[PDB]
Amino acid sequence: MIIFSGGTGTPKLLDGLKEILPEEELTVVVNTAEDLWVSGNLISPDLDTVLYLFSDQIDRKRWWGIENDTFGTYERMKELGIEEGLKLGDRDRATHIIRSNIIRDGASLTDSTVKLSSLFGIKANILPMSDDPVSTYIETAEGIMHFQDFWIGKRGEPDVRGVDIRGVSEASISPKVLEAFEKEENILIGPSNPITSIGPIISLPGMRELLKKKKVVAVSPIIGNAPVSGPAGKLMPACGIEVSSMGVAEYYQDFLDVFVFDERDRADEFAFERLGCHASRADTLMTSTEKSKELAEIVVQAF
């Protein structure tokens, strides 16, 4: 099956999905609207997370970066009081160095994503959403600037006014994604930021039309309870969607077949019906590889 992933929701569900079916049959399409050239090397936060996942080297404490990694190059900056802009792991930088060398040498992102997968021995198909650049900018009253600055800089306090998934219009769906996007038929959108993570992916030209020809299942990245309190909270009304597990479903009401939401919010399920799509219940609060495998079987069984 194919899994649209990004942020931190999906890779968590993968960690369980991988223990439910043969790796070979798994192919995750990672968002690239987050990539950014840092300290002289392209960093694909989302891509690296998946790679580090299927390579048993993901830091399971913070679900980003590499377990037991060292930060000698970083700390230097610290001592010198030079805020690099991110706490890069020495081992996690090597990745940035490798994929960058491939790219600096006329290669493509998708090319590097594979070569890495080989050095890591990953047997699953992990591919970026495209080879063409695409960066997620935020338009607000306090001016326009990279998503990194907005949340990982201003603690995510500023206002909103519209998100510009710049470059996406001219972006072309990776060829290797289209290639795998044939034999398959079961598409799944992980529980992650629908605007900034999955949005870019589906915004790609032709993509939306494609998913309409497959069996798509998505897992709500928002539970009921109190307000979202998440980074998509203020990115919901600025795009035109209501901050609710409902708005999420109505954002994919153009190709979404089976939708899954937490047993928590027992909201008006008849409302999700107003979108003409199946609906099921499952605990999306993954707090363990076990608990996660639990949600994984439901997705599988949801197909």
Added chain:
Amino acid sequence: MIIFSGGTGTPKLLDGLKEILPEEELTVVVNTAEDLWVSGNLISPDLDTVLYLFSDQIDRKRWWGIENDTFGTYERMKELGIEEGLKLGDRDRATHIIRSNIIRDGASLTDSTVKLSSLFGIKANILPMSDDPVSTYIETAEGIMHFQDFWIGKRGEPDVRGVDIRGVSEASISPKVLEAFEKEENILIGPSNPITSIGPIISLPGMRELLKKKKVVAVSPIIGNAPVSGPAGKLMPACGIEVSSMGVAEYYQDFLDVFVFDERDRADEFAFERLGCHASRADTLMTSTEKSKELAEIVVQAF
């Protein structure tokens, strides 16, 4: 005074020169024909050596890199069997990152060399020979390629045919070097590779003419005894100079005032006279900060 430095000879004499006179009066002009963009960051091997010297952080075991440095980012490559091309220290990379960020941001090399000096608290004037790119290539029978490949790749075994200090013709002497190159009058060429280290510096347009208007003192980078057995051995006949402490002096017979050679080779000193320049004796075998300070006072007294 001004000190032309590079390679590993000069920085060794500096370590002693710095303990003989106030740092403020010291200004070393470092060779840049060795710089090279690695893993996404410009590395000035010679410049960094001097910086790490006057910053009490030079690895005194291997006289290159940083004492007690870590190599976590490197070793990763190792494990993956990816020969990066050089063993970069995590702490030594931060330097490459910093100076590169300055440069990537419209700044100049000389600019970065200063900012670094500030973060390091260096009170001496350490400046690159130029802001314009210049790389030392080697022409041989086995083809033409970077100096790095020739020695740090082929163990320095290939033949020769001529050295091309590419880009040097169009290169312009750093403005800050010319600025300091006024008030001063005592120029010193350290005991280092005369072809690949100092050569590039003096090859700069106008430079040779300039030194002819100052009091220049140089220390032979070659002692008598058995054959040179050094990286300049085969780079001596290919340029047109004899592999001897004599050829070295005759290479600067256009501005060299006082020449200094090791007490070792008691060669025909009357031969150095045939170049119309002063000649003195001193142990150039620096095996300690002390032993080095010894040669330092002689240079000072040689002026």
